[PDB]
């Protein structure tokens, strides 16, 4: 059978200048010319941007899942607080 | 460069920019067209600078076109306002005809005003068939035509300023093509509202026969143009429009930073929910999803933008190989 390997970048450390390139503004984006890089080292960068987008998007969803539970928990307390009055 | 929107309503978007300027959105012919649009030096004509190798760069006029001002205030223009604009419009139309050019467009939308109120012509070298409300009969019939083809359009335009729409506006355009050459000259829908000077000026502009149609220079000596007031009378309507334009920009960004307080509290601390009214708690739960897809969308739209120049570069290299 065929075995596809886990993502190679989960273990490879991500250079800090590229995290700066992701936090950079919409404006300063073409500032960097990529033609000088080789075709293969450039593959090893766009993939780390996906991995960063994922770590960044996971944090977004978790925050909203927590805020969702916090809201639903408190709303259950206002409900139980109310019944206890009547 | 990159600044905000101005409109479209015709071809493509036109944008504002600082380098202040404005920009609009077979090649060797395009190049010589702008190259000749640059030779124009008149205070009654929008100045063209360059064309980014098509993206065009032109002078920025802060009050917009008289068309935008009519739509923003929801008011047509009175008679003194028209006469003042048309005088400045006719000058510079005289100028283009001096340089043996024909504007060929001309409509409330291509008459631009600076904040001082100076009207300036725009869009001459940037125009199976299109809308022919402002076109003269001979231009429609593809008979030959000369400089006074603009004068017909000027008459149609002055009706547009006075009533908010050109003649035949409500009709299907493809019907107008064949009604304009045949039917007699258009007139005002309520002639009694307008003076003898204005109606006669439009009567001299809308002569179906071009050889009996007034020229730019001749119309500069018309009573309707002589009683024209200084550019200072346009100051109030320019202030009205600029305030309406500004007030919706405030409503747009006040309603934008309003949605900012439905996003998740950044510190991750949700103990404060004890201080909210049940109704406020319901509202946040409800807004939760619409705001999460907003954050997520603005996340991918940023990352596919940071990630593309990398991909675009790998693509050129594979071709070279
Ligand atoms: N130099 C400029 N300064 C300010 N606003 C401008 C300028 N040029 C164009 N605009 C705006 O652009 C809007 C739309 O222009 P445009 O895309 O040319 O369509 P249009 O003028 O209505 N018809 P057309 O000129 O034939 O393409 C107008 O309503 C103006 O307010
Ligand atoms: Mg225009």
Numbering used by the authors:
A (entry chain B): 291 to 376
B (entry chain A): 28 to 46, 52 to 57, 63 to 90, 95 to 168, 181 to 313, 428 to 488
Sentences from the paper on this structure:
To understand how SAV1 activates MST2, we determined the crystal structure of MST2 ∆L/D146N bound to the SARAH domain of SAV1 (residues 291–383). Surprisingly, MST2–SAV1 does not form an expected heterotetramer through a four-helix bundle formed by their SARAH domains. Instead, SAV1 SARAH and MST2 SARAH form a heterodimer, similar to that formed by the SARAH domains of MST2 and one of the RASSF family of tumor suppressors, RASSF5. The active site of MST2 in MST2–SAV1 is well-defined. The Mg2+ ion and AMP-PNP are clearly visible in the electron-density map. The MST2 kinase domain in MST2–SAV1 is structurally very similar to the MST2 kinase alone, except that the T-loop helix observed in the MST2 kinase structure is not visible in the MST2–SAV1 structure. The K56-E70 salt bridge between strand β3 and helix αC is not formed in MST2–SAV1, consistent with MST2 adopting the inactive conformation. The SARAH domains of MST2 and SAV1 form a long antiparallel coiled coil and do not directly contact the kinase domain. The N-terminal extension of SAV1 SARAH forms two short helices, H0 and H1, which interact with the main coiled coil through several hydrophobic interactions. Furthermore, the SAV1- and RASSF5-binding surfaces of MST2 SARAH are virtually identical, readily explaining mutually exclusive binding of SAV1 and RASSF5 to MST2.
In mammals, the canonical Hippo pathway contains a core kinase cascade, formed by STE20-like MST1/2 kinases, Large Tumor Suppressor LATS1/2 kinases, the WW-domain containing scaffold protein Salvador (SAV1) and the adaptor protein MOB1. MST1/2 contain an N-terminal kinase domain and a C-terminal coiled-coil SARAH domain, which are separated by a flexible linker. MST1 and MST2 can each form a constitutive homodimer through the SARAH domain, and kinase activation is achieved by trans-autophosphorylation of the activation loop (T183 for MST1 and T180 for MST2). In this study, using a combination of biochemical, structural, and cell biological experiments, we establish the PP2A complex, STRIPAKSLMAP, as a key negative regulator of Hippo signaling in human cells, and show that SAV1 promotes MST1/2 activation through antagonizing the STRIPAKSLMAP PP2A phosphatase activity.
